Amino acid sequence: CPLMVKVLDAVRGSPAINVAMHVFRKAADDTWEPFASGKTSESGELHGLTTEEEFVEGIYKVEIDTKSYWKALGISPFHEHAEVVFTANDSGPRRYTIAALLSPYSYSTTAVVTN
Amino acid sequence: CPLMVKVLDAVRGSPAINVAMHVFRKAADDTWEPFASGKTSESGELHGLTTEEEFVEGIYKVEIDTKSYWKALGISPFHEHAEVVFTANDSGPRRYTIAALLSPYSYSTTAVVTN
Amino acid sequence: CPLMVKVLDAVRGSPAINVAMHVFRKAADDTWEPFASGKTSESGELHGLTTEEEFVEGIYKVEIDTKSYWKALGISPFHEHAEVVFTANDSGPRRYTIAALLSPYSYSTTAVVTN
Amino acid sequence: CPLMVKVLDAVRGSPAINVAMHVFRKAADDTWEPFASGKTSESGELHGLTTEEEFVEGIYKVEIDTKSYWKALGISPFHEHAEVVFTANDSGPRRYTIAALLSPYSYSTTAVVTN
Residue B114: which H helix or E strand, with range? Predict the structure, then answer.
């Protein structure tokens, strides 16, 4: 995959399953255009968001609906969502894995960029 | 201080000094209205963003310009910025400390909410 | 304060209050010698562990009893404790702040070192 | 795998490759007995540490030699190593993935416990 997202739940020690997210690409007029979306699987992963041909250099935003996830467990969380905004290489295609670790009042994100 | 932000640098083991950030409040037309801005001090903290009277219920966004911070140190980081989006004061006035821990390819953010 | 520890609770969005910890120093026979202990305050901080004169060069271990903290809240956590092992003062005296962010199945620890 | 470890580098945005670690099991006299060891692969993963039959309930310690990893990149890090101490279910076998995210002055660990 050019772009994969993995989401983990630090309260339960498990993948974060059925988490919805949307991916946007910054349009030339500096507005966010829908690009891809999906929900995580039972492994907490979302694959198949895009293809190499389609995933060109640009500024992308991944918006993860963490609030609905916590509300489903009966927890009132702090964040409205988790956002990850990045430039996809200013030097050609590459493979991006975005990981997100969720708690009700905290999240961390990392990127793994391999070849 | 109804709203304080603290930023740490996980590469150097230091406060993140002179990091710019912008705070926005979601307006009635569902656009982001600029609310406050500033830079962190030598302790990595930004105080004095707002008062109890001005900090009403609403949805707020804190945008931390992490890319300029890393670029000044010679590092091309992954994220364009770190964003924190949250509802504030929906059960009455609270005090919010937002902490952010920065690395070039990862960040964590954590909120402490006191009454 | 040559050595201070701050502990936050990522589930509740609060300082982690009344968390016990034990500090050890590696002795000449390569065993751990008990150095200092205490509990965090209502601000989640533990001050006053040592003085500049007593805090000599060496290898130190901070053991934070996170399991008792979670169990008191009804949660069976993953870790037995959180441990931080580091060399201190090997380039001369420094001030160390150790921060720990706790969730039941995850923790993060971060050091700020100032001269 | 009953027990797998994955290590990521938050400075470079990559798997942490060739990181050495040792696993210990607490002996009945409260001493740490060597149990397994290995180095991470090019994917930052270490598989094949143990088998279901051998991995019985107990207290285990994973000691990750993060200091050698950073020194190989020319960085003087804070921690001597990263330690993860846990009880392997007080209610039978299960599958454990331990993830560790490394920076020079910070690390985070999480556990994913699936069935």
Answer: strand B106-114
Tokens of A28: 């030339």
Residues of C in Cβ contact (< 8 Å) with D79: 84-86, 111
Q: Write the burial class of residue B78 (CB in 10 Å: 0-12 exposed, 13-18 middle, 19+ buried).
A: buried
Q: Is D101 on the interface with A (CB under 8 A)?
A: yes
Cβ of A103 within 8 Å of Cβ of C108? The answer is no
Cα D103 from chain centroid?
15
Q: In angstroms, how far is CA B47 from the centroid of its own chain?
A: 11
Please classify residue A95 by burial: count the beta carbons closer than 10 Å to its beta carbon, then call 0-12 exposed, 13-18 middle and 19+ buried: middle
Half-sphere exposure of A97 (CA within 13 A, CB side): 16
Q: What is the DSSP string of D37-73?
A: EEE--TTSEE--S--TTT--SEEEEEEE-HHHHHHHT
Asked if the Cβ–Cβ distance from D110 to A15 is below 8 Å, we say: no
Q: Per the annotation, where are the binding residues of D for L-thyroxine?
A: 6, 45, 108
Contacts of D21 (CB under 8 A, 6+ apart): D5, D37, D38, D39, D40, D46, D62, D63, D64, D65
Neighbours of D28 (CB within 10 A): 7
Residue B15 is nearest to which of C8, C108, C112, comparing CB atoms?
A: C112
**Which backbone phi and psi does A68 adopt, to 5 degrees?**
-60, -35
The span from the first CA to the last CA of chain B, in angstroms, equals 12
Resolution to 1 decimal, in Å? 1.6
User: For residue A71, what is the enclosing H or E element?
Assistant: helix A66-72
Beta strands in chain C (DSSP E): 3-9, 14-15, 20-26, 32-39, 45-46, 58-64, 79-88, 95-103, 106-114
Q: Which chains touch B (3 or more CB pairs under 8 A)?
A: A, C, D
Whose CA is closest to C57, among C26, C97, C22, C23?
A: C26
Residue C81's SS3 state is: strand
Best mutation target among D67, D83, D94 (most C Cβ atoms within 10 Å) is D83
**What CA–CA distances, in Å, run from D43 to A114, D5, D7?**
9, 11, 9
Rounded to an integer, what distance in angstroms lies between the CA atom of residue B23 and that of residue B39? 11
What residue ranges do the domains of chain B occupy?
2-115
